[PDB]
Ligand binder design. Structure first.
Ligand SMILES: Nc1ncnc2c1ncn2[C@@H]1O[C@H](COP(=O)(O)OP(=O)(O)O)[C@@H](O)[C@H]1O
Ligand SMILES: NC(=[NH2+])NCCC[C@H](N)C(=O)O
Ligand SMILES: [Mg+2]
Length: 356
């Protein structure tokens, strides 16, 4: 590694040490030993530790703070990734390997809120990376364009419920983009954590969204991951939402080669998204449990759930609507991940009904 990058690394390490109230997993796990062990390393694509940690150095409010510029980085900088992955995912040892893909028995999934008084909408997403393309910080503009063509052409073959249209972000009207984001379908533009990871270069080239006309099946192209594959609808019918996601992911996988790792399962740009890559969520109102929000977050954590705002992570709740989802994605099957959301949300609703 070049001196300028080493210099920047020493200054970032210092900045993290000095930030007394920073609570990122980067600060917690980047010890002097770990840092010295990997700061002179570089991947075959030229990714350095600075590329890995810069977002967490610049955004001290990060919860995690690191990303992988390429797949190799997960091992080149293993002494930092491994403890962070073990911490975030609630246990994932050096000797552990993510299990084979296993959607489970869908008929064991239920309707999460039959009377309809708490849950607004239910969503399940996965992420996938295309074999032969590195993650965002290592992509060229031309590669973004190649990937967009490949994914949009593949999605032109979706049929029946999943048939839909690709809408590139380049050329999309501001009004349409804002409506799709306000309606919770399209990814936000301008995320500071992704920007400082150099994940948004050449924006909006190569970025876009595919969706069926009802907007119950969507695919994001070239946001944080090469693909995010999404099923969602109003209400609490997790069984329906999940079955549509399964159908779509199995069909897309038969067509496009995605990166999968013996230890980490499906590869993604952030270590929180490895393994199953799955985030199953509800938009839910729980006014009594959320009155003291520390009670909401504490309750959620005991069910291995995460609370996000209405417009996603790093946002506030609006009108009492919280996004609550499984936090863990690696070291448990797809079935186990969606069941952590189902089981936890059914109990939070029971607790809300029982609360004073
Ligand atoms: N259950 C849900 N219902 C409706 N919209 C949802 C739901 N869960 C998440 N969203 C939306 O998903 C978008 C992405 O939020 P984000 O927190 O970045 O999640 P991810 O990237 O994991 O999909 C936002 O527009 C957010 O409002
Ligand atoms: N979209 C994500 N990968 N979210 C989890 C990480 C987000 C951000 N890098 C942080 O450390 O808080
Ligand atoms: Mg996101």
């Amino acid at each position: 590694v070049d001196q300028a990058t080493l210099d920047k690394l020493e200054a970032g390490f210092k900045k993290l040490q000095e930030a007394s109230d920073c609570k990122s997993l980067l600060k917690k796990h980047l010890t002097k030993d770990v840092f010295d062990s990997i700061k002179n390393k570089k991947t075959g694509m030229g990714a350095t530790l600075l590329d890995v940690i810069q977002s967490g150095v610049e955004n001290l409010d990060s919860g995690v703070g690191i990303y992988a510029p390429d797949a190799e980085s997960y091992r080149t900088f293993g002494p930092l990734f491994d403890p962070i992955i073990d911490d975030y995912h609630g246990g994932f040892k050096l000797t552990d390997k993510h299990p084979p893909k296993q959607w489970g028995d869908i008929n064991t999934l239920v309707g999460l809120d039959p009377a309809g008084q708490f849950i607004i909408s239910t969503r399940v997403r996965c992420g996938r990376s295309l074999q032969g393309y590195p993650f965002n910080p290592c992509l060229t503009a031309e590669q973004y364009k190649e990937m967009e063509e490949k994914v949009s052409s593949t999605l032109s073959s979706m049929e029946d419920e999943l048939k839909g249209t690709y809408y590139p972000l380049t050329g999309m009207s501001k009004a349409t983009q804002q409506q799709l984001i306000d309606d919770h379908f399209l990814f936000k533009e301008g995320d500071r954590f992704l920007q400082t990871a150099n994940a948004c270069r050449y924006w909006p080239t190569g970025r876009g969204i595919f969706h069926n006309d009802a907007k119950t099946f969507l695919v994001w192209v070239n946001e944080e991951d090469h693909l995010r594959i999404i099923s969602m609808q109003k209400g609490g019918d997790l069984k329906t939402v999940y079955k549509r996601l399964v159908t779509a992911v199995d069909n897309i996988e038969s067509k496009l080669p995605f990166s999968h790792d013996d230890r980490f399962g499906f590869l993604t740009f952030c270590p929180t998204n490895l393994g199953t890559t799955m985030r199953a969520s509800v938009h839910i109102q729980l006014p009594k449990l959320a009155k003291d929000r520390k009670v909401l977050e504490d309750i959620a954590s005991k069910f291995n759930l995460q609370v996000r705002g209405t417009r996603g992570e790093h946002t506030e709740s609006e009108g009492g609507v919280y996004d609550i989802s499984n936090k863990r994605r690696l070291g448990l099957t797809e079935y186990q991940a969606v069941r952590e959301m189902q089981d936890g949300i059914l109990e939070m609703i029971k607790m809300e009904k029982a609360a004073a």
